[PDB]
């Protein structure tokens, strides 16, 4: 399911490694989709890889999970942090045990061997604002969502989205502060509905974590509100396609966490095969979206991007 045609040497010699992928939450479309990725990697490599996460999204549950992994003397850790502040300790601990750490969606992380981002997050959120802005006519009031308030990427998107609006749609403004919805759609529902009857006007929703797409879709379907309240954010067609075809939510974007999952494990073995002097800018993974990597910060030269995402109202996807 990950297209592996061009590819590299994540190879040898003659060893297989044990690499766990630690994710925000095990349960929802996004990471199910990542799981196909990690598993295909196991097919194509025979490394002891698997994916694990909290039953429900929790800072402390991820921390615990990594602890388990510490206890097992695993070879690498690949983590998509729910709260970066929360895991930097147990990761520091891990590195001490000569464990390799690969991060994702966590660009300000320090204690990793490397971190990879699918794209420029500032740019990403801006593209969500560019859309939402049109829908609303660049005039109304809007509200934003994040999973954790310590999910870096999502903060970056919302930061990059607000920054656009202030420069491009100065007659719009954040109706209220950011909503922590904790990557749960039923919770994005309640928190949106709550802010609806507190600021009834609000005619725009900006969603960073995938479920918000479902959560806001649901709210728009139930009561009014098609055409009066607009949505732009991350989503998958899996969880939101019907809300798109029904005119309920107007634009969603994303990347393929299956490929992102692959890339992570590739970097993990590269590191583990001690090719650290090859994991640098311009490096080609040979995966769609990872053909040339970027290290834009001179200060964090092991912060890698990652280029390109996907926009939808033409649902070709799964």
């Amino acid at each position: 399911t990950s297209k592996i045609n061009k590819e590299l040497i994540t190879t040898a010699n003659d060893k297989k490694y044990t690499i766990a992928t630690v994710v925000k939450v095990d349960g929802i479309a996004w990471f199910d989709r990542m799981r196909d990725g990690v598993d295909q990697f196991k097919a194509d490599t025979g490394n002891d890889v698997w994916m694990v996460g909290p039953s429900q999204a929790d800072a402390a549950a991820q921390v615990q999970i990594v602890e388990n992994l510490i206890a097992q003397g695993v070879d690498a850790i690949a983590i998509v942090p729910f709260s970066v502040e929360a895991v930097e300790p147990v990761l520091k601990k891990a590195r001490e045990r000569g464990i390799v750490v690969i991060s994702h969606e966590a660009s300000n992380i320090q204690n990793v061997d490397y971190d990879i981002e699918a794209f420029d997050n500032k740019a990403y959120g801006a593209n969500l604002m560019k859309e939402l802005g049109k829908s609303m006519g660049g005039k109304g009031k809007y509200v934003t969502t994040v999973g954790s308030l310590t999910s870096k990427s999502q903060m970056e998107w919302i930061d990059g989205a607000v920054e656009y609006q202030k420069a491009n749609f100065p007659e719009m403004s954040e109706a209220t502060g950011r909503l922590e919805t904790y990557d749960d759609a039923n919770t994005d529902y309640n928190k949106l509905k709550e802010a609806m009857t507190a600021y009834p006007d609000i005619t725009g929703i900006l969603g960073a974590p995938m479920p918000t797409s479902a959560g806001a879709g649901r709210l728009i379907a139930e009561g009014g509100l098609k055409g009066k309240v607009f949505f732009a954010g991350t989503g998958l067609v899996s969880v939101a396609g019907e809300y798109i075809k029904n005119d309920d939510v107007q634009y969603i974007q994303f990347w393929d966490p299956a490929v992102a999952g692959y890339a992570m494990n590739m970097l993990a073995v590269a590191a583990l095969e001690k090719k650290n002097d090859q994991i640098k800018a311009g490096l080609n993974l040979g995966l769609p979206g990872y053909e040339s990597l970027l290290a834009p910060d001179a200060a964090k030269p092991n912060l890698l991007y990652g280029a390109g995402w996907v926009g939808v109202t033409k649902e070709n996807m799964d």
Side-chain angles (χ1 to χ4, degrees), residues 1-5 8-12 15-102 104-112 114-187 189-272 275-318:
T1 328
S2 165
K3 176 187 68 48
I4 51 181
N5 315 2
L8 252 294
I9 76 180
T10 47
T11 67
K15 176 157 228 311
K16 304 313 173 304
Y17 292 104
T18 292
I19 305 132
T21 309
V22 179
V23 305
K24 285 165 178 220
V25 48
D26 199 348
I28 56 171
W30 197 271
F31 294 105
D32 296 12
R33 181 68 163 134
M34 182 168 290
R35 179 184 297 292
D36 308 331
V38 179
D39 282 343
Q40 167 167 342
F41 187 88
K42 190 207 171 64
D44 306 15
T45 59
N47 281 282
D48 187 15
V49 314
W50 81 99
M51 217 193 58
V52 61
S55 328
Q56 288 95 38
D58 193 27
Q62 268 211 359
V63 188
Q64 189 51 46
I65 292 182
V66 181
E67 288 268 58
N68 304 3
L69 300 164
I70 290 301
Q72 322 182 10
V74 302
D75 294 331
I77 297 189
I79 176 175
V80 186
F82 178 60
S83 146
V84 180
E85 280 78 336
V87 285
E88 270 277 6
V90 49
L91 293 179
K92 192 190 176 207
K93 185 180 200 63
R95 306 257 294 148
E96 293 176 8
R97 306 213 179 239
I99 284 182
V100 177
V101 178
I102 302 313
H104 175 52
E105 259 176 292
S107 91
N108 60 1
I109 205 84
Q110 292 177 347
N111 291 136
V112 300
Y114 304 89
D115 165 273
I116 179 191
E117 299 289 299
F119 47 68
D120 181 24
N121 297 292
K122 199 158 145 171
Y124 181 87
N127 210 275
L128 292 166
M129 190 60 265
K130 170 193 121 190
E131 308 276 342
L132 178 79
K134 264 37 167 207
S135 292
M136 297 170 44
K139 294 305 225 74
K141 228 159 257 224
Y142 71 106
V143 65
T144 65
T145 62
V146 296
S148 182
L149 202 87
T150 161
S151 307
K152 227 306 180 190
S153 51
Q154 318 203 345
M155 294 289 277
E156 279 182 333
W157 304 340
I158 296 298
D159 283 3
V162 166
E163 181 165 79
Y164 191 89
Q165 165 264 320
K166 288 189 170 144
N168 276 260
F169 296 107
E171 271 213 37
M172 282 174 24
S173 75
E174 262 177 314
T176 187
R178 287 142 202 229
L179 311 180
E180 282 168 324
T181 71
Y182 297 93
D183 272 276
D184 184 321
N186 193 286
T187 303
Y189 183 69
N190 301 336
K191 285 220 175 317
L192 284 178
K193 177 158 178 39
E194 163 280 337
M196 280 294 173
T197 53
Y199 310 91
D201 64 301
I202 302 199
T203 38
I205 293 172
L206 209 297
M210 164 196 84
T212 305
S213 55
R218 163 170 160 192
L219 180 55
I220 296 198
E222 307 180 0
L225 252 192
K226 295 163 61 183
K228 147 144 203 207
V229 175
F230 311 84
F231 174 91
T234 302
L236 291 184
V237 313
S238 323
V239 310
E242 176 120 45
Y243 289 139
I244 298 195
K245 225 179 304 212
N246 275 82
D247 286 278
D248 299 314
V249 308
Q250 285 80 327
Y251 172 95
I252 70 163
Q253 64 190 47
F254 60 83
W255 67 102
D256 198 343
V259 199
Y262 215 99
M264 266 185 285
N265 281 271
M266 287 191 59
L267 295 183
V269 308
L272 270 172
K275 310 178 166 157
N276 276 267
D277 53 22
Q278 190 169 353
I279 303 152
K280 69 201 184 151
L283 174 49
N284 183 334
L285 261 50
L287 303 168
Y290 309 91
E291 320 275 10
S292 186
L293 295 192
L294 290 177
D297 198 335
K300 298 161 178 300
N302 69 1
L303 161 61
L304 291 23
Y305 307 72
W309 64 84
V310 181
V312 177
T313 323
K314 301 309 178 281
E315 331 161 305
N316 156 282
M317 318 297 193
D318 66 308

